[PDB]
Structure formats: structure tokens, C-alpha cells
Nucleic acid binder design. Structure first.
Lengths: 46, 77, 93, 63, 102
RNA sequence: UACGGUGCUGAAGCAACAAAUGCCCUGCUUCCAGGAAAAGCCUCUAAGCAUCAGGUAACAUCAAAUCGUACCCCAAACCG
RNA sequence: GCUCGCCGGAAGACCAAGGGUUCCUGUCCAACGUUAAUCGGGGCAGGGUGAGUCGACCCCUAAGGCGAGGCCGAAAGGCG
RNA sequence: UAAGGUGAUAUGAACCGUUAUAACCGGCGAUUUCCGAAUGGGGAAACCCAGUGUGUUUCGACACACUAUCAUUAACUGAAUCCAUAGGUUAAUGAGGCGAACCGGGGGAACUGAAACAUCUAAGUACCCCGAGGAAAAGAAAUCAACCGAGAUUCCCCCAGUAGCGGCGAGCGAACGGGGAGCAGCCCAGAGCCUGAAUCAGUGUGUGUGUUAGUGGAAGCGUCUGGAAAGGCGCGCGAUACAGGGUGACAGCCCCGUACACAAAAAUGCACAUGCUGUGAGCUCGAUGAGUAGGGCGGGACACGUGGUAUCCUGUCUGAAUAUGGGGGGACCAUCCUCCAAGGCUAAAUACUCCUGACUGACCGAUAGUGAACCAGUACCGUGAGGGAAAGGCGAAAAGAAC
């Protein structure tokens, strides 16, 4: 039936997208914890 | 935050303690009213953010170091 | 005069391909491999400053390297950029 | 210096990035994609010679 | 520095047939040496379908760990030392015994 | 060609009738819930200028990048 | 191949967001795939989608978001 | 610094060296794409698009250069607006983002305890917000102390579980002073005499010795088991060197090493002299920290919780004196002692590890030890914050198995 995931990049890249996460108080902190975890990517949008 | 520019007056630590005897916080602040005045080194009248007694500090304390300290912090007048 | 050439490094392969030897009935235009360093704004007027060629029309195409390499890991075969340039007869390059 | 001061001057070496690129590099361009360039040092011997001048244009020849 | 350098005869204490010695060909930045006449392994290799292969035994000189190899003394059929000390400067081999720096 | 097609060339190519989901139609009538904005676009004028630039009409003529383009597609190429 | 049964406002054909070479050809046997595999959408080697006009961008705007100067908040941050 | 090398998967291919461009190591620089502070102007992570100049030809256009805002300050300009101010256009200096700890200030719980709860406990503890430096912060007595005296501060141990506070419950809890480490103190509201005098900071040099780019370093042979020994047999030898690893079943003498020694354009720790530069000792007179010291109301931090209650602070009203004065000393008063607040700075004895090097563990040795001893925060799961593995070990050795 209907899934809760419905794919669209316009919406997913303004949702969990890097550019406003890199421009907001707590979004900047996700990036700092991910540099500390040592992830290959900081983004989740590609 | 609402602060006095000539005295550096800041928010304070303080409690209710009456009805009840409790250490409950209430947020205590200086009440701002401002003053529009003259300093002879500026070619203009100046409006500066001041609170209670802060205008009476300008009356008889030397302020040229504070007028420079505001500018050393980049604060505007 | 006709732009500065202090940076000029046009072309990367004389190239060999089957669309030039199994469907090429007219010498009009020849296919090349040029990489992500070329554009139809440039390869129409700049190639003549390095090579002795004559060109009247061009095309360019991105050409992705499909998907996957030998593993190791998935990796890439890499995109290689396709170009089509005027020839009209014989060999030019 | 002795013979390195004879007939070569800074204002001629100022154009070396053109004369290397339109000669020494051009004679090697796409020849590995033609099967004519197999000797892996022929490019390596014409690298660095421009970078040497582009450095000496701001770095001095002594202590 | 490798005491056996690169073209010396090494007595090879290893193997069964002690009456034989080898000669150096190359040295690695690892604890390894390539020596001609080290173990005489013939080795056939598993064949390949395509392209011309030389085929048969390769008879190639193999690797040994640098600890197992010392120079042949050319006097009594024993191992010897080379030395690297020279009180005027940089290293030289002198059989740990010569009046000259050779 | 003893054959995968070949690839030059060509006849008839008209009329009624029924209807849009299409066109005249960002038409008309009618209803009352009166149903985005701005730029490109068209004009008026300031500045700018006649060394021209710009405009109208006609003839010539250059490039027009950037990324896209395959395929699945109401699906074993989207999600379960 | 031939004959049979079914859909046919779909079980046909095209498409935007969706994914992105899964297309076309040869080849594979090992892993996979509701049995078995000679088959592949899974593997390997080859072949390929060219633009001023069609898509997106270049230019415009709604709801809204961000924002020098100006303001609020210990502050981060928020308005505008 | 050397006679051999040109990264790894990794083969394959091709060359580069002996003496200066083989390879490469240390220092000081040059160059330093797009996104990211990210900043010419815009953006939905690496894309999109200008402004202002210079130069030049055949001038349907390239090459090269400069450019967020904010703040400080100046220049030029300039609205209402006269003087002026913003606004406009530049320049010089400065913040901005980041790995780690130490560390300064702010906002600040609930859990838990009182064997229920409400002041109190817990606790200025976590989490959060901003942020600086080699350390941060501390700092040169309107201070303690009790009539004897001490004479900035920090750290360590005592002081202490002592005093003091407590729905006097449950509980809380200093400071003075002592021991040790350690030992720089000064300036302005002024300026004459004095003159670079005291005391430190920055930098150069030399001496002594470590560190840094480096690597030379004594002695073992035969024979036996066995695939092969360093074991076993026989006998020696070096030892200011028998640490440990590696090397074919027990190595000081096979190899690396060890002890030991050499190693410097230039930089540096530590000791010690000194060339240069900066600060600038000393004398005397004069002045001296006011809308504040307090007081009132309502509170805070001090161990102290409206008490007999002090100190220090202050939202807010009020407000006094200058040595013939004022503060503090557990209410308050008198006495007496002891200081000079409402102005400004500062040395290191202390703390710590992003990062460079070294030494130690009856440390673990793979259901152990860090999410991982292997292209592991990878594969992979989730819309997302977030979460996230599995396989160590052939043998002396590829000797990797032709025919």
C-alpha cells in the first residue's frame, strides 16, 4: 500500500539537506560530531 | 539584553524568597529610559542607553575612557 | 589577436571507435575523445591555433563511463567526453 | 654567473610558459592515445622547467 | 648498510648441501636478499591459456633473509666480516683486517 | 551480390455525415464565492550622446554557454 | 515456428518528480533468482543516446525563508 | 645523506643515478583549483552570475589585477540642514572557521537524600551558550591579626571533619594560621631636579652539554641428532657491549642492535658570560580615586538557611566625609587596634596533550585489548538525528604444484 517514504530531491534536499544544516545552530553540530566520528561523508543527500 | 552603556550595568542573581521561602528565580533587570545629551568632542547631540542612576553617573564621572571602550567593543552611539 | 594561447592544450586522443567504422558513410564529421576539458564554444575556433585543421561545425556529449570497475570496490570507469568535429574528407588528425 | 649570464635574460624567460606549452608539450600531446609515446620519461624531462622560472620570478638564487 | 652489498659471494649456512655457496644480485629495504645459487628450486608454474609463456622450469634465484648470509672468506671455507669503521670519515669495507680501505 | 536487402524512382491521394476529451476560446451568455505577482514585452519621459549609441524597413552575418537527453515508468530499472 | 488462451480507458504506448546505463550485442555457471536453469533486470567484455528553439539554468514571482543599517534576547539565536 | 632507485593496491610498462636535478631527509620560503569562515554577487556541498581597471591587434573578448559586511581611524563626499550627522566612495589594522586538553565568564536542571514533603538535600553537578592564552585565572592590603605580630598571589600537605550554618530535621561545612614548593613588583590623575642609573623583555654571539636532518659499534669454530639447530658433544673468545627482536626445535660471538662515539647552514632546552634594542632607577613638592561608603525595601554570593547577625555584592529609592576623614574587627554602642575603598597593570612555582621524540606495566594476545590488530566508522541499517559489523594465524620457504 502507501509507504511513508515518498521520493523527491527538492523536498529531501531542503529537509535533511546540507546547506541549511551548515547555516543553523544545531545543524552545524551534526557536522562537528560527524567529523569526530570520522565519516566519509557529512551529507546524507546524494 | 537591556544593559546600561556608561556604567556597564548587567542582569543580576536573585530569588523570590517571599510566598514561599523558595529560591525560585524571577529574572531581575535594570529599567532603561535613555538620555539625549552633549559631550563637546562629538559635534552633535548623542542619545545613549542608560537606566536608573546611569544619567547621574554622566553628570559627574569622567566618561571619555568608556566612550572609547564602547568603540573598542564596536558598540554604537 | 584571437585570444591569448598561454594556456592552450586542446585535444587528448586521436581516438578509435566503431561508430566511425560501422556506420560512417560520409567523412563530413569525425568522432573524438576529449575529456572534461573541452566545449563546443572552444573546439570550433581554438583547435586551429595548435593543429593545422579546418572546422565549420562541432558537437559535444558528456558520455558517462557506464557503472562499476573490477573489485576491489565498485569505483568508476570515468566519463571521457565525446566530441564530433568537421573533416569532410580523408584524415585531419 | 660566468656563462649563464650570456645572451639569456629574465625578460625572455618571462615567456617560457608559452614556449614550453606551444613546443615541448605539444610534441607529446595525445601521442600516448596514438601508441607513439611509450617512453614514460619524455614528459617528465619537460615538466618542472616552467615551474622553476615561475618560482625564480619571486624566489632568489642564493642565501 | 648491507655487509654483503650487492655482488659478493655469500657462504649460505642454509640448506642440506653445505659444500655450496651463492652470489648476491639485489638487496631490498626489507630484511631480504636476492642470491644466485641459494636453493636451486626449479619451479614449473601453473600454465596460462593466452599469450606466449616461456614455460617449463624457471630455475630462478630466490629470496633469503639477510641474517642467513655472510661473505665467503676465500682462505679456509668459512664466513667472514667486512667492517664499516674508518676514523677519518664515511664508511668503507676492509675485511675488518686490511691496512687499506678495500 | 545466388543474398543480410538494395535505394533510386512512382500511381490514386477527392466528397459527404456524427461528435469532442481538440481549435476559433485568456469567445459569448449567465452566476456570485469577483477568482497571483513580476520580468521579458509595448509606450511616455529623465539621464546619456550625435565621433555615436539606439529605433523603423531591407539585406548579409557570428555564437547561443551551462547541465539534460539511454532506459524502466503505473513497474522484477520508482517504493513495498 | 505453428497452433492455443487472456488484456485491450490496459495486462497498450508516451511522461514529470523517481532511479540513473539496468538500453543494444556477445558471453557467463561461480554467487543470486520462490522448482530446474541452457536465462537474466546478477556477472564479464564490447556498442550507444550530438540541440539557440524540447528539458533545466541564464531572467520573474506566490506562500515562505534569509537579511547590512535598525531592533529583541544571558548568549547561541530570533525579527525586519 | 648515498650507490643505488622512480608511493600503495600491483602487477604491468618505461627509465633515472654514482658529483651538485638518482632517490630522499631537516629548515626558511614560492605556488596554493571549486565547495567549506567562505566573503565580488547568487545556490538545494564542489554549481550559477557580475562590477572596476590594465594591455593589445586584423578589435563578433581574451589575458592579467583588484573587490563581503561589521568595528576602529582617516580621507574624499554628502539628506532633511545652516555648522553638523547619517548615507555615499576608499585605505590601514582587527574579529570571523578548525584539532585536543588544560582553562575564564554566563544559562542551569531533574535524578537522589529528608526512609512521604514544601526551606534544606542533591548541586553551580550534567547538559548548554560565549571565549582567551602558553598557560587561563590569581595579584601588590580602606588585608589579616588580637595588643604579640605578619606584610601581593598561586600550587602541594596540614589546619578539618575544627569553628560556624541546620523544618536543630536529613544533614551541611570554612577560614585564619602552620609545614613545603616558589620568590619582580609597579603606574596614572605632574613635573621640576636626576639621567639613562633600578628591573625585566626582545634579539645576536660565545662557552659547556643535550635535542634536531645522520649511523659507525668487540668475539665462533668444528662436530651430532634432525627437514634445518644457536639444542647436544669438544674446545675457545669478546665483554665499561649477554637489552630485546629477527634469523629453519633453547643465539653474546648470524643479522639488527646494545654499551659507546661521531653527527650542525641554522633553530632550540638548560646552565653561564656578553654585543645591540626597548622599558627606565633616584630626589622633592603637589594631588588622590563619589551619584559612592552607607542607609531603606526586596534579594544574592560568602560553609552561614531573618538573625543576637557581621562581611562583600545590588534590582531600586535615597546619599555623607578627607586624615581635625573614613572602613573593618559575627547584632548594636563605647574603647582600642589595624588599613587607605569607590583608579589602572603584572613575573612563575600550577594545569594539559591536537602534535614531535623517549622510557615503564606478574598489561591484553582475538567472545581479550579501543566500534576495527586486514582500503572498519569500511560493508551496512534509517526520512533523519543516530546507529553499524564479519575473516587474524599454510610452511623453513612459494618451494604456490609441470607432466
Amino acid at each position: 500500500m502507501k509507504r511513508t517514504f515518498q521520493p523527491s530531491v527538492l523536498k529531501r534536499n531542503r529537509s535533511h539537506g546540507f546547506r541549511a544544516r551548515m547555516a543553523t545552530k544545531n545543524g552545524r553540530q551534526v557536522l562537528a560530531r560527524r567529523r569526530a566520528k570520522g565519516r566519509a561523508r557529512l551529507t546524507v543527500s546524494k | 539584553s537591556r544593559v546600561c552603556q556608561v556604567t556597564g550595568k548587567r542582569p543580576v542573581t536573585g530569588n523570590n524568597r517571599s510566598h514561599a521561602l523558595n529560591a525560585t528565580k524571577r529574572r531581575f533587570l535594570p529599567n532603561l529610559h535613555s538620555h539625549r545629551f552633549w559631550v563637546e568632542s562629538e559635534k552633535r547631540f548623542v542619545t545613549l542607553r542608560v537606566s536608573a542612576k546611569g544619567m547621574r553617573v554622566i553628570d559627574k564621572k569622567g566618561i571619555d575612557t568608556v566612550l572609547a571602550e564602547l568603540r573598542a567593543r564596536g558598540e554604537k552611539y | 589577436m584571437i585570444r591569448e594561447e598561454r594556456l592552450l592544450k586542446v585535444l587528448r586522443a586521436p581516438h578509435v571507435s566503431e561508430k566511425a567504422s560501422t556506420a560512417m558513410e560520409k567523412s563530413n564529421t569525425i568522432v573524438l575523445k576529449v575529456a572534461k576539458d573541452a566545449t563546443k564554444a572552444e573546439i570550433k575556433a581554438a583547435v586551429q591555433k595548435l593543429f593545422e585543421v579546418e572546422v565549420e561545425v562541432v558537437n559535444t556529449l558528456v558520455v558517462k563511463g557506464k557503472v562499476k570497475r573490477h573489485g576491489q570496490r565498485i569505483g568508476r570507469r570515468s566519463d571521457w567526453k565525446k566530441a564530433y568535429v568537421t573533416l569532410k574528407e580523408g584524415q585531419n588528425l | 654567473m660566468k656563462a649563464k649570464e650570456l645572451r639569456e635574460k629574465s625578460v625572455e624567460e618571462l615567456n617560457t610558459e608559452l614556449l614550453n606549452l606551444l613546443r615541448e608539450q605539444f610534441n607529446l600531446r595525445m601521442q600516448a592515445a596514438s601508441g607513439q609515446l611509450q617512453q614514460s620519461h619524455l614528459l617528465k624531462q619537460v615538466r618542472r622547467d616552467v615551474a622553476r622560472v615561475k618560482t625564480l620570478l619571486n624566489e632568489k638564487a642564493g642565501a | 648498510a648491507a655487509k654483503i652489498r650487492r655482488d659478493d659471494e655469500v657462504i649460505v649456512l642454509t640448506g642440506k648441501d653445505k659444500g655450496k655457496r651463492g652470489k648476491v644480485k639485489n638487496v631490498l629495504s626489507s630484511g631480504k636478499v636476492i642470491v644466485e645459487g641459494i636453493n636451486l628450486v626449479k619451479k614449473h608454474q601453473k600454465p596460462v591459456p593466452a599469450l606466449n609463456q616461456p614455460g617449463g622450469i624457471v630455475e630462478k634465484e630466490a629470496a633469503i633473509q639477510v641474517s642467513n648470509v655472510a661473505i665467503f672468506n676465500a682462505a679456509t671455507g668459512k664466513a667472514d666480516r667486512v667492517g664499516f669503521r674508518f676514523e677519518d670519515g664515511k664508511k668503507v669495507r676492509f675485511f675488518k683486517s686490511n691496512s687499506e680501505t678495500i
